[PDB]
Amino acid sequence: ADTIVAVELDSYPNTDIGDPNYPHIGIDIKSIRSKSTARWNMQTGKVGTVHISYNSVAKRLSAVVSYSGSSSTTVSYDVDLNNVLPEWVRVGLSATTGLYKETNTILSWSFTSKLKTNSENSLHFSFHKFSQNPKDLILQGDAFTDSDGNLQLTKVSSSGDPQGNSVGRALFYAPVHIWEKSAVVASFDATFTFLIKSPDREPADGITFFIANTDTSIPSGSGGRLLGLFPDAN
Amino acid sequence: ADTIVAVELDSYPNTDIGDPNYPHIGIDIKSIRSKSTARWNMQTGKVGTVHISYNSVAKRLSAVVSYSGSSSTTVSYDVDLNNVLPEWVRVGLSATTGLYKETNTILSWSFTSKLKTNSENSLHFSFHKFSQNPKDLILQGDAFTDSDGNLQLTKVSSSGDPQGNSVGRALFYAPVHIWEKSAVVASFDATFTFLIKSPDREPADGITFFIANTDTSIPSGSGGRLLGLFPDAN
Ligand SMILES: OC[C@H]1O[C@H](Oc2c[nH]c3ccc(Br)c(Cl)c23)[C@@H](O)[C@@H](O)[C@@H]1O
Ligand SMILES: OC[C@H]1O[C@H](Oc2c[nH]c3ccc(Br)c(Cl)c23)[C@@H](O)[C@@H](O)[C@@H]1O
Ligand SMILES: [Ca+2]
Ligand SMILES: [Ca+2]
Numbered sequence: 185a186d187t188i189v190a191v192e193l194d195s196y197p198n199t200d201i202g203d204p205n206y207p208h209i210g211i212d213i214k215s216i217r218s219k220s221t222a223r224w225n226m227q228t229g230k231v232g233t234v235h236i237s238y239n240s241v242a243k244r245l246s247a248v249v250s251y252s253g254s255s256s257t258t259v260s261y262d263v264d265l266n267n268v269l270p271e272w273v274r275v276g277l278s279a280t281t282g283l284y285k286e287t288n289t290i291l292s293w294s295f296t297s298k299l300k301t302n303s304e305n306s307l308h309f310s311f312h313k314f315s316q317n318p319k320d321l322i323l324q325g326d327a328f329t330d331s332d333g334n335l336q337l338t339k340v341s342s343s344g345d346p347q348g349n350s351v352g353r354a355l356f357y358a359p360v361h362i363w364e365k366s367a368v369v370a371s372f373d374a375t376f377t378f379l380i381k382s383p384d385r386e387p388a389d390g391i392t393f394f395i396a397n398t399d400t401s402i403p404s405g406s407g408g409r410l411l412g413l414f415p416d417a418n
Numbered sequence: 419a420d421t422i423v424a425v426e427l428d429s430y431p432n433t434d435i436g437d438p439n440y441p442h443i444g445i446d447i448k449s450i451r452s453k454s455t456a457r458w459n460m461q462t463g464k465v466g467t468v469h470i471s472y473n474s475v476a477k478r479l480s481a482v483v484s485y486s487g488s489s490s491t492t493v494s495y496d497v498d499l500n501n502v503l504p505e506w507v508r509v510g511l512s513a514t515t516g517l518y519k520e521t522n523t524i525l526s527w528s529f530t531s532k533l534k535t536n537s538e539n540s541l542h543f544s545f546h547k548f549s550q551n552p553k554d555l556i557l558q559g560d561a562f563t564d565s566d567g568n569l570q571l572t573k574v575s576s577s578g579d580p581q582g583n584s585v586g587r588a589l590f591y592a593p594v595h596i597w598e599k600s601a602v603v604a605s606f607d608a609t610f611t612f613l614i615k616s617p618d619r620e621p622a623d624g625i626t627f628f629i630a631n632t633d634t635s636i637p638s639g640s641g642g643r644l645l646g647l648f649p650d651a652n
């Protein structure tokens with residue numbers, strides 16, 4: 185199986201796999217059962233921004249979600265990611281719909297990763313517009329770029345309606361080196377902005393930012409509640 | 419008095435104010451009595467690098483010191499810096515000597531600060547060479563730039579010998595805005611490289627990176643063990 189570290193913006197409460205009974209943000213370490221959650225005050229039709237950071241001295245993964253002029257939600261978890269992840273990884277975003285649905289529109293995505301050895305290596309990307317044929321992104325499943333230059337992670341109809349039972353992802357083309365033998369310290373920071381809309385009072389299922397093995401693929405069975413990240417709910 | 423947050427590279431153990439009995443790195447929050455220390459494997463005559471980071475969601479200040487090919491030392495402390503510090507600050511480096519002494523040579527210094535509001539603001543500087551008349555630095559006390567483009571925080575003789583009972587600092591000219599009312603998240607990262615040499619088996623006293631009120635000045639009495647940061651040892 186893949187090795188997965190994610191931050192979930194989870195809009196649909198699946199109590200049976202341990203979601204709290206409200207939309208929330210989560211830190212996912214090699215499971216869909218979030219190590220740490222916080223109440224997400226979901227605003228449909230409103231553009232949101234998520235920021236994520238981590239470094240290897242502090243060993244705390246953190247995320248904050250907000251909407252313009254509105255309050256913020258934060259989530260943190262103490263974890264040494266270089267004991268969890270392999271040295272080389274790819275970074276990406278995922279989303280799903282299920283029985284219920286929502287547009288999973290990414291308007292922009294940026295990412296910075298640094299590696300210092302005791303003897304600096306660096307990668308940075310930002311997309312504020314996605315191109316119609318994004319050579320620097322590996323698009324998986326249902327994911328596509330639209331005419332407005334937005335990245336849609338899940339299916340929508342020509343008229344704009346989201347569809348159910350969809351899974352999509354986008355990975356940055358280049359692998360990222362997150363730890364080394366002579367390494368002193370590593371860190372990363374990521375930002376995206378997103379637009380989720382639904383014709384459902386209980387929109388579903390959510391969006392993640394994730395880091396994984398370089399050859400990561402959409403696992404069979406990973407639909408709806410599993411956010412296109414895990415083959416099961418263990 | 420000033421409001422002070424620092425990371426100390428402390429070479430001289432003053433047990434009476436709570437130093438451990440070995441060189442160490444420390445997180446100083448509004449006292450010289452470090453909230454968190456770690457054993458510093460001091461290497462005199464060897465160039466070292468220190469990296470420091472923090473963000474306001476994670477609320478963990480961290481630092482790591484190393485020398486080329488040699489092992490690392492890390493220190494961390496959970497602290498919400500925006501409850502400790504004022505909104506506007508200046509950043510700087512300090513050093514001292516006392517009865518014992520050491521060169522306190524800074525070879526390079528860099529700093530990045532970010533502020534995001536829910537509606538990004540940014541500052542970055544790096545010096546890999548300091549100029550002979552550094553208009554972008556506020557030099558305090560004994561601090562000067564030499565002909566090699568290094569920043570010497572404390573007195574040295576023309577022949578290169580460090581002198582005792584010296585205090586010096588360098589602040590970045592521009593104030594930094596670290597928190598706001600509508601702010602979502604703030605972070606900073608700082609790096610310097612340093613060269614400490616001594617004709618003493620017990621070199622003294624150390625170097626800090628620090629953040630403080632914008633009108634910060636060398637406090638009277640702040641010499642030797644107080645690292646040019648605090649008027650007393652409380
Ligand atoms: O999109 C929302 C959810 O729809 C599905 O689970 C269901 C939620 N309500 C239901 C009601 C009936 C049945 Br049948 C099913 Cl599987 C479900 C599944 O696809 C879940 O993974 C997903 O989280
Ligand atoms: O530079 C080392 C130290 O020298 C001084 O403290 C002393 C260390 N050894 C001593 C021995 C004698 C006397 Br007198 C004094 Cl004050 C001291 C003081 O200046 C200290 O602040 C400083 O840490
Ligand atoms: Ca869910
Ligand atoms: Ca000391």
Ligand SMILES: [Mn+2]
Pocket residue numbers: 192194203210216218
């Ligand atoms: Mn969840």
Ligand SMILES: [Mn+2]
Pocket residue numbers: 426428437444450452
């Ligand atoms: Mn100390």
